[PDB]
From TrEMBL, chain A:
GO terms for molecular function: structural constituent of ribosome. GO terms for biological process: translation. This is Large ribosomal subunit protein bL17. The lineage of its organism: Bacteria, Pseudomonadati, Pseudomonadota, Gammaproteobacteria, Moraxellales. Belongs to the bacterial ribosomal protein bL17 family.
From TrEMBL, chain B:
GO terms for cellular component: large ribosomal subunit. InterPro entries: Ribosomal_bL32, Ribosomal_bL32_bact, Ribosomal_zn-bd. One of its GO terms (molecular function) is structural constituent of ribosome. Residues 1-45 are annotated as: Disordered. Residues 1-21 have a biased composition (Basic residues). NCBIfam families: rpmF_bact. This is Large ribosomal subunit protein bL32. It holds the Pfam family Ribosomal_L32p. It comes from Psychrobacter urativorans. GO terms for biological process: translation. The gene is rpmF. Keywords: Ribonucleoprotein, Ribosomal protein. Belongs to the bacterial ribosomal protein bL32 family.
From TrEMBL, chain C:
GO terms for biological process: translation. The keyword Ribonucleoprotein applies. This is Large ribosomal subunit protein bL19. Belongs to the bacterial ribosomal protein bL19 family. The lineage of its organism: Bacteria, Pseudomonadati, Pseudomonadota, Gammaproteobacteria, Moraxellales. The gene is rplS. One of its GO terms (molecular function) is structural constituent of ribosome. NCBIfam families: rplS_bact.
TrEMBL record, chain D:
Part of the 50S ribosomal subunit. Forms a cluster with proteins L3 and L19. In the 70S ribosome, L14 and L19 interact and together make contacts with the 16S rRNA in bridges B5 and B8. One of its GO terms (molecular function) is large ribosomal subunit rRNA binding. The keyword Ribosomal protein applies. Belongs to the universal ribosomal protein uL14 family. The gene is rplN. GO terms for biological process: translation. This is Large ribosomal subunit protein uL14. It comes from the Bacteria. The lineage of its organism: Bacteria, Pseudomonadati, Pseudomonadota, Gammaproteobacteria, Moraxellales. Binds to 23S rRNA. Forms part of two intersubunit bridges in the 70S ribosome. The keyword RNA-binding applies. It comes from Psychrobacter urativorans. Keywords: Ribonucleoprotein, Ribosomal protein, RNA-binding, rRNA-binding. GO terms for cellular component: cytosolic large ribosomal subunit.
RNA sequence: UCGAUGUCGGCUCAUCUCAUCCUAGGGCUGAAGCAGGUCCUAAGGGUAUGGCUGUUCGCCAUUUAAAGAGGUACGCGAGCUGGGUUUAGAACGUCGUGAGACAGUUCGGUCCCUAUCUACCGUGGGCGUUGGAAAUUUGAGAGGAUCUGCUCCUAGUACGAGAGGACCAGAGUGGACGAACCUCUGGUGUUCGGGUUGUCACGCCAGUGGCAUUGCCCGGUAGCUACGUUCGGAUGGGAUAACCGCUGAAAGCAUCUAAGCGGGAAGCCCACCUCAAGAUUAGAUUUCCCUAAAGAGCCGUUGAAGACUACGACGUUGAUAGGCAGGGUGUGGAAGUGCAGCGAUGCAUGUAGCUAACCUGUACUAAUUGCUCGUUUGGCUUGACC
RNA sequence: AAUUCCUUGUCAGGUAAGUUCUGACCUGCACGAAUGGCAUAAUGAUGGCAGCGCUGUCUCCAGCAGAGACUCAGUGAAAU
RNA sequence: CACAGGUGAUCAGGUAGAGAAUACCAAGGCGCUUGAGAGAACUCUGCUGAAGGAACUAGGCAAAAUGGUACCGUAACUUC
């Protein structure tokens, strides 16, 4: 069973899945629009949006928490310099997922992840 | 572990009576007028009156 | 709090008042005892080694060495059997559960005091 | 939870120091004995020139367990050892001194002297 | 022998003054609105049909909406029937209310619910099969079914042989539970025991058939 | 059956018989009571764990109400094992000049098959059920379940020289078994919190991250779960078995039987739980709708529902999911700064910081009134009504 | 007894209980002195038996992680 | 077979470390030519496990356990 359990597996180890979603969060913070697999896009909200919520308030401790979970100093600077301010008064929902068909190489359902308010 | 007789073509085809290609639901985008998969953006980036590129 | 609001209404009417205490301190629990037809209180004194804070399901386990053999009791906080709790001496500990004290006996089983 | 082939400390002065459970009594497939349950034991190590000798087969009552005993309020009460008290051929204590605490599950009629001789009754 | 439909809200405990914890589960009881009375003349048997809860109109079909409007009751999340008799149908007319006062404190009830669904399960969990040797050369049959029959005679597997399959997600009745407390104003029923299902699931509480 | 039907024993999982081991009902007794013995009825349930030996068995220990006798390819190796027996190595005793041999022993010695069909366990799709639809249902029938100890009391009464010690009634509390459940007690808890070893990195310090089984270690939420909790196995109805009768002739008597009327079992049929109209005999009731309707489905957001399905919820007339907000819980005292200290470190700011899956909310994001299917009053005959 | 059929010989020890083991007896079916006899420190992935520690071996299985199984897309066997 | 096998010699960075063991890195080189989901039974490979601790089994098979350096201490027996 998996009654009430959250999270994903995605055919990876735990540390691989953590690394992949850290990579995906950095890529989304950089480009503001990324094409990915639909299950990955849905799980990406649960890891990318809390970083925006935390960057809503700028402090040394919060920037260090962002860096511990993101490991990208340029993306931490961007997250606390443009995305925190932009989404300051938005109660969540900083990403929008737009389904965009199926991948050629393996027929994976695909989606576009967009930062809300320009991307 | 293996069949004692070859299956007849009739029974082989009765087992395939459930094979069926999936047919996608389609809609017309309000802005562009273009056909698209329902709940999916158009090939050129339009979904529910919103651009993506 | 973690429950349905009706479970909360049933649970909140049964809360009993009690002093605060942390894992690590020495407490005396006054335990109601039915000796037959008579009611008396029996004192269980020892170190709080673990708590679970669950509202009306709150529990705390107290450990003592009584006549050589170690005794743990996992008291239910809001049970009426707990007649009273007094904190005798407060401990300074680095964790919430002192299960490592089950393999300590004398000099090595002693908790630093919190002042 | 005591089962066959469990070592118990001896909590009385009958001369045995360690016993082994060889039967949990009171049921055809009965698995476990808790406090207050009567078991068949062999005594595995006794004190010299005591009442009981090593290799003897006799009755005991479990008086404390490491699994614990439950109380009506939902509390559990655990001990650091598994300990029994040897019994007669009529399941009556053969003890004049009880060592360590016991629980109030021995209240009744046949273990009342165990209760009254214990240094402390939980 | 008419009962009521409630919602399992979860379990807690009730302490007695003597210091005993009673494991209880709480049933949320919205009023059970009588939508239909069945009788020997029109239906051939006697029963009370009730609806409880609420449903939005977009989810209430025209047939069900007409059925509810005939009774004059607001649509609930479901419709349930209770086998009654002449004494049970005494003052229960269409459009009426059944509240938690149908049950008194201390009385025995049976609770029916939908079990928690375990999905597809093997013989070990579904039928308490013994596992086979973890070691000692066992090849790949640790949780295997074992033998399923005999030789040439009978030459088949008998019906009702315990095997893997779906487990849970079935209708289960727990009998002889005690009503710990009743609160009609709060819509609350506190019942000693366990009560099949998960919290949120629909449960049926009826006066006990053993008694 | 030799163009192959794998041996013994164990494990797992059984299924039937009754010549009955326990429990139930009886007659007789060299039946005072308690215990028995024998036979009759009875197959509903139940019917141990170890030591030895490859054992089956058997002996033994300790239990139990009891530790049944059997059939099922001496049930079950395309389910497992492989200890014995039954290949090739080697040795002993023995026999043989020898090669070798031995229901003599001894040490060692490859167990394959992805399941077509029948069967079985689950779960769907189709069509049908005299127009269609949303629900609620009756129950022809099927399955499950069916065990039992001990204590107290009656009563130390009846009975008995004593020793001992009841039936029949009543109350309680267990074992084994089963179900559900997670409040409690615990287990687990690899997207929770800390501590810590080595090394590499983030420019460096500080702070952090990668990797080393989750590096190791200590805790632990939800969920799942038992060893935890709660519940169940009915003391009822009907007809009976053996057995016991009442009245009563055949057969002036007697006689349970021939007519007639009784009693009587864990057994049978109901009662309890679950399933159940493909019960093609396809049942019933309430509503809704018919120049594409009522509805259903696709799709989407999904769920203690789930392999796929199906089932449940919701789709802006919205809390369905995620986020977010406030809580709770867990961890246990963040970072930065300051102070004390030569320093490791300690202390304060402050139970702080962080906190998965939990609780209550909230349209911020995503759930597009899109498309498909599904119609147009439902044949004929007879009868009652009209 | 790597030898003993009868045979689980008998007696002792060990276990609650020991067809195995250890000691002894001698009734050696059918030991015996270079097809060597009886021992023997050390050595052995050698045989038997017994303990301590340790344990999911088991009572009695639970939870969790990964890889398959399951669903989709591509490719596409097998014995019979 | 673009096959988890086999195939002689040579060169031999850092930090720990006795080490050419091991862990993590350098230079250099790779991610091993189906993916995507789901997160049933069952299989495999692991991790944790209340109480008990060999009751398992032919048999402790498997697992669990022990494990370094210095120092102290170390029995029967012995070919010393």
């Amino acid at each position: 069973m998996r009654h009430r359990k959250s999270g994903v597996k995605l055919g990876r180890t735990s540390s691989h899945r953590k690394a992949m979603f850290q990579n995906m969060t950095n890529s989304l913070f950089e480009h503001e629009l990324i094409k990915t697999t639909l299950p990955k896009a849905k799980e990406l909200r649960r890891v990318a949006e809390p970083l925006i919520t935390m960057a809503k308030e700028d402090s040394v401790a919060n920037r260090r928490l962002a860096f511990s979970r993101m490991r990208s100093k340029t993306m931490v600077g961007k997250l606390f310099g443009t995305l925190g301010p932009r989404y300051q008064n938005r109660p969540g929902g900083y990403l929008r997922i737009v389904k965009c068909g199926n991948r050629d190489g393996d027929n994976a359902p695909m989606a576009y992840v967009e930062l809300v308010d320009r991307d | 572990a293996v069949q004692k007789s070859r299956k007849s073509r009739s029974r082989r085809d009765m087992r395939r009576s459930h094979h069926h290609m999936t047919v996608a639901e389609l809609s017309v985008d309000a802005t562009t007028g273009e056909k698209h998969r329902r709940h999916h953006m158009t090939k050129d980036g339009f979904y529910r009156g919103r651009q993506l590129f | 709090s973690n429950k349905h609001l009706l479970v909360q209404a049933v649970e909140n009417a049964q809360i009993i008042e009690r002093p605060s205490f942390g894992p690590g301190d020495t407490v005396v629990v006054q335990v109601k005892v039915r000796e037959g037809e008579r009611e008396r209180l029996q004192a269980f004194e020892g170190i709080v080694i673990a708590k679970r804070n669950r509202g009306l399901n709150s529990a705390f386990t107290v450990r003592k060495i009584s006549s050589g053999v170690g005794v743990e009791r996992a008291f239910q906080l809001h049970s009426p059997i707990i007649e009273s709790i007094e904190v005798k001496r407060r401990g300074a500990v680095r964790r919430a559960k002192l299960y490592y004290l089950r393999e300590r006996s004398g000099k090595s089983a002693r908790i630093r005091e919190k002042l | 939870m005591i089962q066959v082939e469990s070592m118990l400390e001896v909590a009385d002065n009958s001369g045995a120091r360690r016993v082994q459970c060889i039967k949990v009594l009171g049921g055809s497939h009965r698995r476990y004995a808790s406090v207050g349950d009567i078991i068949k034991v062999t005594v595995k190590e006794a004190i010299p020139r005591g009442r009981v000798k090593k290799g003897d087969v006799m009755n005991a009552v479990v008086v404390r367990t490491k699994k614990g005993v439950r109380r009506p309020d939902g509390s559990v009460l655990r001990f650091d050892d598994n300990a029994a008290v040897l019994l007669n051929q009529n399941k009556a204590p053969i003890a004049t001194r009880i060592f360590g605490p016991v629980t109030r599950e021995l209240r009744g009629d046949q273990f009342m002297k165990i209760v009254s001789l214990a240094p402390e009754v939980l | 022998a008419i009962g009521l439909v409630g919602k399992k809200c979860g379990m807690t405990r009730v302490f007695t003054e003597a210091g005993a914890s009673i494991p209880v589960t709480v049933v949320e009881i919205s009023a059970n609105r009588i939508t239909q009375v069945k009788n020997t003349d029109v239906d051939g048997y006697q029963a009370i049909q009730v609806t409880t809860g609420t449903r939005r109109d977009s989810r209430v079909t025209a047939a069900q909406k007409g059925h509810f409007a005939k009774a004059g009751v607001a649509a609930g999340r479901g419709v349930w029937e209770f086998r009654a008799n002449d004494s049970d149908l005494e003052g229960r007319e269409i459009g009426g209310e059944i509240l938690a006062d149908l049950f008194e404190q201390g009385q025995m009830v049976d609770v029916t619910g939908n079990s928690k669904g375990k999905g597809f399960q093997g013989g070990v969990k579904r039928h308490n099969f013994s596992m086979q040797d973890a070691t000692h050369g066992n090849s790949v049959s640790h949780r295997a079914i074992g033998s399923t029959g005999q030789n040439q005679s009978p030459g088949k597997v008998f019906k009702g042989k315990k095997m893997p399959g779906q487990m849970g997600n079935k209708r289960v009745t727990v009998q002889g539970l005690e009503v710990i407390s009743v609160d009609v104003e709060k819509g609350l029923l506190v019942i000693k025991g366990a009560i099949p299902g998960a919290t949120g699931g629909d449960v049926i509480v009826r006066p006990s058939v053993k008694a």
